[PDB]
Amino acid sequence: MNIFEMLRIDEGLRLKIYKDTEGYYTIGIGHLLTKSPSLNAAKSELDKAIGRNTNGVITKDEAEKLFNQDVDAAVRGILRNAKLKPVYDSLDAVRRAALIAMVFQMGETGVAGFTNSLRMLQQKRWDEAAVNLAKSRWYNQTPNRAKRVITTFRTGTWDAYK
């Protein structure tokens, strides 16, 4: 199991523009296009991301390309984030993947604000961080997915994804 498979499980794969859990225009494997309510705005963003007139649809390969880019960006985001970097560096390989998944889902900025959880994670206080992570809008809105990420931090194994 790895970060790619993990997120592929959590996000799914859709080849046609769609609205995410927040009602935002997305496509592929969790690739947010725009927060604008305009389907045209999204179609435009889409065409610009892919480099062609897509008409709201893309191929599996294009979806995968966006996904790789997105994963790469999340890692780079973490590495360049002063609050995130140190946490990441302190963790083992399974847990690093869980932090990447959180950043992928909610952005570098969103994660950087879980100050208390981040500190618990750095201190290797697993159960406590797990409890703290659950007191969030994130968990309340997408509980099944959040539980999977949280169990990953708690246990340091991929059991939740198996």
Smallest gap from Cβ 148 to Cl ion, in A, equals: 8
Closer to Cl ion by CB, 142 or 152: give it.
Answer: 142
Residue 105, interface with Cl ion (CB under 5 A)? no
Nearer to Cl ion, 40 or 144 (CB): 144
Distance of alpha carbon 39 from alpha carbon 27, whole angstroms: 12
> Taking Cα atoms as reference points, which of 154, 145, 124 lies closest to residue 6?
145
Task: Choose one: 55-63, 110-118, 140-148, 150-158; the region binding Cl ion (CB under 5 A).
Answer: 140-148
- Is 116 part of any known ligand binding site? no
Strand 25-28, strand 31-34: pairing: antiparallel
**Active-site residue set:** 11, 20
Binding-site residues for substrate sit at: 32, 104, 117, 132
